[PDB]
């Protein structure tokens, strides 16, 4: 569902 | 699928020089470009993030520019600590790196001292023969090392090893090892390495006769 | 200060499984994505895997897809890389790296890497080195200095430590990087430049230690009469 380059941290 | 290619692969410069390194992306990556520094035996270190933003602690002499497919890393005045390999990295579509650009110390041309060692009596008893040619303390790093057995050019039976550039005098050293079977080695007389280098006005041969050492 | 410590690397045969660990400190591990990156002479820098802060989303490079799995245990502050069906082309230094801090950006790289752990995949078996002298002579001198050394030949795996006169001699020593021969074995040479006048009155012994084979050899290097 996500872009692998998207924010991988808590948000 | 985004290929990063840098240029040049090797850059020779002096302390105080202004140097520039270019990185090219096979497709547009906007500003999603990172510059890394790495010295031998150490992990890569992030210097510039998002094309132009220096990380904390990076001296102001470093800077980066570019957007899209063409990127540049610049060191306004080269510092002794800056000689290393530099990698670019895109982080928009997975993560892929360039092949690196080594920034190397540029000193005056230094011709190598050439030395040759015959095989030991111990090794010859075992059944093989190793002849070693030693090129010591030269610059630049490019050198031609040609083994000749009775003037017959050898091919595919030698190996080379080059040190890192010396931190003090900025020279390289190189060792070439020719190996044959005992029975092949005993068939011939004159073993020699021919060395071609920028500091040698003409190739320099060191040789010896089998059995006369 | 961010600290990442890889571990678990080693020398293994192809077709085996190996699991690397990365222990983090100096930052909130459970709130950051983490990366695995490897580096080899043949392939350069290769991204391997990423795992989200909570261990959910995982993405892998094509070259490791189906063979490697990434995982994490936030209670232990550890990142893991399970490798299966290892091949020789998997040989590399494997680094662990923390994702860049949260901002308004929609794309994210990495900022801090660990020191690295080496994974060597090879079908070669452990073998001690043979140590042969490189005898000084008139063909290894120029202008008052003479070169001598030792040939550390046909051993596996890395590394070997080489000292001279039990470590008492440290100047003029050049220990060359080992070359991987096509046999699967390594070889290296260690040389030292000494005064020509000393060869008659000074003894030179190279000391080689190869821990994987519990091998240690002392080889006296004597001049040749030529």
Numbering used by the authors:
A (entry chain P): 1 to 11
B (entry chain L): 1 to 94, 96 to 214
C (entry chain H): 1 to 52, 52A, 53 to 82, 82A, 82B, 82C, 83 to 100, 100A, ...
Excerpt from the publication:
The 10 mAbs that exhibited high affinity for the major repeat and varying degrees of cross-reactivity induced two distinct conformations in the antigen. All seven 1210-like mAbs contained a bulky Lys or Tyr residue six positions from the end of the HCDR3 (termed here position HCDR3(-6)) that directly occluded the MGG4-like conformation through steric hindrance. The presence of an HCDR3(-6) Lys/Tyr appeared to correlate with IGHJ gene usage because all seven 1210-like mAbs were encoded by IGHJ6∗02, where Tyr is the GL-encoded HCDR3(-6) residue40. We observed that these differences in affinity were associated with the specific aa situated in the HCDR3(-6) position. In addition to its aforementioned role in shaping peptide conformation, this HCDR3 residue also formed important contacts with the first residue of the N-core. For five of the seven 1210-like mAbs (Ky15.2, Ky15.3, Ky15.5, Ky15.7, and Ky15.8), this position was occupied by a Lys residue that formed a salt bridge with the Asp at the beginning of the N-core when DPNA was bound in this site. Ky15.10 and Ky315 had lower binding affinities to junctional peptides KQPA and NPDP compared with the five 1210-like mAbs with an HCDR3(-6) Lys residue. Overall, the 1210-like recognition mode resulted in significantly greater total BSA than the MGG4-like configuration among the crystallized Fab-peptide complexes examined here. Specifically, we showed that the 1210-like binding mode confers stronger cross-reactivity and inhibitory efficacy than the MGG4-like configuration.
PfCSP is composed of three domains: an N-terminal domain that undergoes proteolytic cleavage prior to hepatocyte invasion; a polymorphic, T cell epitope-containing C-terminal domain; and a conserved central region largely composed of consecutive major NANP repeat motifs. In total, 22 antibody fragment (Fab)-antigen complex structures were solved at 1.54- to 2.95-Å resolution to gain insights into whether differences in potency are associated with different features of PfCSP repeat recognition.
